[PDB]
């Protein structure tokens, strides 16, 4: 239904997943800065400007960048990323 976070199931490829994970200088959280065309990331439903909520079922909102990276890299084959699209308080 509307405005639900989306589970993106990425199947790792030979060059990884094909996205860039970024911290923001103004908002807490980790975000998808870009998604390589035709990558495992793209096929999973991930999009630039998505915000990461969970990795493999575990909430990552309290973690430092390096720890979130480690969590994504934990399984050889895959990563399950729960994400939401951009939002702004007005």
Curated annotation (Swiss-Prot):
Q: Which residues form the signal peptide?
A: none
Q: Which positions form S-S bridges? A: none
Please give the tissue specificity annotation from the record for this chain. Widely expressed.
- What are the residue boundaries of the PDZ domain, all occurrences included? 6-86
The cellular location(s) given in this protein's UniProt record come to: Endomembrane system; Nucleus; Apical cell membrane
List Phosphoserine occurrences by residue: 39
Subunit structure, interactors included = Homodimer, and heterodimer with NHERF1. Binds PDZK1. Found in a complex with EZR, PODXL and NHERF2. Interacts (via the PDZ domains) with PODXL (via the C-terminal PDZ-binding motif DTHL); interaction is detected in glomerular epithelium cells. Binds ADRB2, SLC9A3, P2RY1, P2YR2, SRY, RDX and LPAR2. Interacts with MCC and PODXL. Interacts with SGK1 and KCNJ1/ROMK1. Interacts (via the PDZ domains) with SLC26A6 isoform 4 and isoform 5.
Q: State its role.
A: Scaffold protein that connects plasma membrane proteins with members of the ezrin/moesin/radixin family and thereby helps to link them to the actin cytoskeleton and to regulate their surface expression. Necessary for cAMP-mediated phosphorylation and inhibition of SLC9A3. May also act as scaffold protein in the nucleus.
The name under which this protein is listed is: Na(+)/H(+) exchange regulatory cofactor NHE-RF2
Q: What's the source species for this entry?
A: Homo sapiens (Human)
According to the entry, what is the taxonomic lineage of the organism? Eukaryota, Metazoa, Chordata, Craniata, Vertebrata
Residue range from the parent sequence:
147 to 230 of 337
């Amino acid at each position: 239904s509307m405005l639900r976070p989306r589970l993106c199931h990425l199947r790792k490829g030979p060059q990884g997943y094909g996205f860039n994970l970024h911290s923001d200088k103004s908002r807490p959280g980790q975000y998808i800065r870009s998604v390589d065309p035709g990558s495992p990331a793209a096929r999973s439903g991930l999009r630039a400007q998505d915000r990461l909520i969970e990795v493999n079922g575990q909430n990552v909102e309290g973690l430092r960048h390096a720890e979130v990276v480690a969590s994504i890299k934990a399984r050889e084959d895959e990563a399950r990323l729960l994400v939401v699209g951009p939002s702004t308080r007005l």
